[PDB]
Amino acid sequence: WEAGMSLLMALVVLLIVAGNVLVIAAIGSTQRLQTLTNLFITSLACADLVVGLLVVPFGATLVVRGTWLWGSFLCELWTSLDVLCVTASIETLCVIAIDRYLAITSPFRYQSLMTRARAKVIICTVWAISALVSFLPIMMHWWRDEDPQALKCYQDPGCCDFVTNRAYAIASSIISFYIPLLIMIFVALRVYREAKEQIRDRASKRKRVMLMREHKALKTLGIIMGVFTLCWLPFFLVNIVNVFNRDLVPDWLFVAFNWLGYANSAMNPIIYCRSPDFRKAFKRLLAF
Ligand SMILES: CC(C)(C)NC[C@H](O)COc1cccc2c1CC(C#N)=N2
Ligand SMILES: CCCCCCCCS[C@@H]1O[C@H](CO)[C@@H](O)[C@H](O)[C@H]1O
Ligand SMILES: CCCCCCCCS[C@@H]1O[C@H](CO)[C@@H](O)[C@H](O)[C@H]1O
């Protein structure tokens, strides 16, 4: 592992940036990929794209140099963007979970109402809600603390630690993560028990094949979500324990799970290779 993880980090920017750009272009070419569900996937990709383009590069100069070299302002701005992307992602994963549920339960009402021009409004909203609950409180300094040590970090332009009061710490992590998480999980468990009773004896390859595509594609969504959890959940669990006893967890561990979450921005394009369409579409653009 000390090899794979060591290699992983030198290409993360690449694997994220190139991996996600490869996904947005794959769908922008094949209109057979141009569906409703794949529009939310593009949102997800834009999030991850920003991560590897802004979040990770600056996170790298900080970790490597062991100091912030960009100034007090960009520090806050970088922090904002970082928080915005994670919230937007977990919310979009909710929308997707709910979308697939309403397309499984109310098919008719789904087709006459859910249009391509409307899924775009739904996406602009999720970026709007995330900008509110993530970007604004940081701008109004609702995050800050009063501890001498905390105040010490704010006077230093070279310090970019997210030292926050225990009120904010708990509120922001519940709003951004745990709520959409619990919602996405709950809804995702529902969509599964629905997809199980569908394929649960007397139908030709007319109904079997159409349910063979809409089950292999659903299984991928469940992975995108399950993976997203395994990556970020640790960071947020530790972020809560820090509130109870601030000296219980080492700082290197705090930075450990945070880069684990960043890895999720490169994993998506990879999992999308469970589909022939994407797989072929990738090899298309890669001049194979
Ligand atoms: C180096 C930094 C600190 C930039 N990493 C931030 C992390 O990626 C994301 O942290 C958060 C994401 C969403 C919601 C959050 C959150 C931290 C808190 C708190 N209280 N609420
Ligand atoms: C889209 C802009 C995102 C900024 C995110 C970090 C905000 C830090 S507080 C912010 O700092 C600015 C510069 O000092 C002031 O001019 C503002 O009044 C104040 O609210
Ligand atoms: C995303 C929303 C996070 C809300 C966090 C809980 C509400 C208080 S935050 C913070 O508490 C400080 C001490 O009470 C006050 O001095 C500040 O003015 C205030 O901003």
Curated annotation (Swiss-Prot):
A lipid is attached at A287 (S-palmitoyl cysteine). GO terms for molecular function: beta1-adrenergic receptor activity; identical protein binding. GO terms for cellular component: early endosome; membrane; plasma membrane. Disulfide bonds join C75-C160, C153-C159. Residues 29-37, 99-116 are cytoplasmic. Homologous desensitization of the receptor is mediated by its phosphorylation by beta-adrenergic receptor kinase. The chain holds residues 40 to 359 of 483 of the full protein. It is found in: Cell membrane; Early endosome. The keyword Cell wall biogenesis/degradation does not apply. Cyanopindolol binds at D82, S172, N258. The keyword Nucleotide-binding does not apply. Residues 65-76, 141-166, 245-249 are extracellular. The gene is ADRB1. Belongs to the G-protein coupled receptor 1 family. Adrenergic receptor subfamily. ADRB1 sub-subfamily. It comes from the Eukaryota. This is Beta-1 adrenergic receptor. Keywords: Cell membrane, Disulfide bond, Endosome, G-protein coupled receptor, Glycoprotein, Lipoprotein, Membrane, Palmitate, Phosphoprotein, Receptor, Transducer, Transmembrane, Transmembrane helix. It is a multi-pass membrane protein. The chain crosses the membrane at residues 1-28, 38-64, 77-98, 117-140, 167-192, 215-244, 250-272.
